[PDB]
Amino acid sequence: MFGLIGHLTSLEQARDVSRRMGYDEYADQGLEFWSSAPPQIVDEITVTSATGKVIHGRYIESCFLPEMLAARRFKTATRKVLNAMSHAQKHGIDISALGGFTSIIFENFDLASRDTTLEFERFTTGNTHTAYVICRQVEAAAKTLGIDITQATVAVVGATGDIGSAVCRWLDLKLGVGDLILTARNQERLDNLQAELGRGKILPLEAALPEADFIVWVASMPQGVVIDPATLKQPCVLIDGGYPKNLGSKVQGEGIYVLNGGVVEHCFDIDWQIMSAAEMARPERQMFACFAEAMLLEFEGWHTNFSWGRNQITIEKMEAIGEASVRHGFQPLALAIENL
């Protein structure tokens, strides 16, 4: 049994999903309502691999709301995630993914540090897979645009994050990228990253972007961030790989292509109503890679926290989850040539 732990996206979207959760669609549901709403298993899921193997999952609604952050209700926000995790476990789910804010939250509040104790091998961030997909997207994109990745330049914004640092290890060792630009907030970690890599030019954001054929956006987007279309190279690909994805609407311009990063398309229809179904071109087949990771671990029978902590993702783990991804019928989302 795999699990997909997710969360609401706005107060209005929660009222949409409200009824299906046993609640009154037209009642007063305030931030305080969803703060006290308990976690619920909400959707039963049956995925069928390309090999023929059938697996079963549960989508667990955590009721976390990004407004709980906005209202500085960080302990309430922490609680939602941990409850959701604890709910997964009591119902005997073997491996669950924390999608969207869920894992960001689990990290920035060191939640590794209720009734019973949580088994962490029962959960995964799905980040190893997310990093793997993001890298297949760079590779794919470069082939599509006629760009030798061996000569090209990739800026990894957030290169010190769990996802970002995994992307750099792969872009270096696997694609053999030409120039790798590192970008992040913490100078110390940027130094330690480039030391492990043996390469990479550390740069501030507004020097990074204009060198880059590919930009891998994988960090908490700062406030007052000016992305000026006009400074970017004229064939440019921006891979929005973090949660939430907002580049699609904050960056627009001729020869600029924004691509949802870390998204996968399955080979067969899946019947569900998940967390970002509304932002997927093809909801019945498209999902976050971190969720798909949870599925790959259950297809393979690897019941462990395959992805966990910060900067632990290794090339070898990325390799293993990658070919599990392919074998079971998952393709990276790709550029859609309606690019005019």
Author numbering: 1 to 113, 118 to 344
What do the authors say?
The earlier discovery of the pathway responsible for alkane biosynthesis in cyanobacteria allowed the conversion from solar energy to alkanes through photosynthesis, without providing external carbon sources. This two-step pathway utilizes two water-soluble enzymes, namely acyl-acyl carrier protein (acyl-ACP) reductase (AAR) and aldehyde-deformylating oxygenase (ADO). AAR catalyzes the first step of this pathway, reducing the substrate fatty acyl-ACP/fatty acyl-coenzyme A (acyl-CoA) into the corresponding aldehyde in a NADPH-dependent manner. Subsequently, ADO catalyzes the conversion of fatty aldehyde into alk(a/e)ne with one carbon shorter (Cn-1 hydrocarbon) and the formate as a C1-derived form. Here we report the crystal structure of AAR from Synechococcus elongatus PCC 7942 (SeAAR) in its apo form (AARapo), together with three structures of AAR in complex with ADO from the same species of cyanobacteria (SeADO), in which AAR binds either substrate or substrate/cofactor.
In this work, we solved the AARapo structure at 2.8 Å resolution, and modeled the complete AAR protein containing 341 amino acid residues. AAR is composed of three domains: the N-terminal domain (NTD, residues 1–130), the middle domain (mid-domain, residues 131–264), and the C-terminal domain (CTD, residues 265–341). Residue C294, which is strictly conserved in AAR homologues and has been identified as the key residue for catalysis, is located approximately at the center of AAR molecule. Above C294, a wide cleft that includes the dinucleotide recognition loop is visible. In the AARapo structure, we built five molecules, which show highly similar overall architectures, in an asymmetric unit. However, three fragments, namely Fr-I (residues R19–Q29) and Fr-II (S113–T120) from the NTD, and Fr-III (V221–D235) from the mid-domain, show higher structural diversity, indicating that these regions possess an intrinsic flexibility. In fact, we found that the mobility of these fragments is pivotal for the function of AAR, as they are involved in either the interaction with ADO (Fr-I and Fr-II), or NADPH binding (Fr-III), as discussed later. In the AARapo structure, this acyl-tunnel is broken by the side chains of M279 and M21. The N-terminal segment (H7–A37) containing Fr-I is more loosely packed, potentially hindering AAR–ADO complex formation in the AARapo structure. AAR alone adopts a loose conformation as shown in the AARapo structure, which represents the resting state (ligand-free) of AAR (S0).
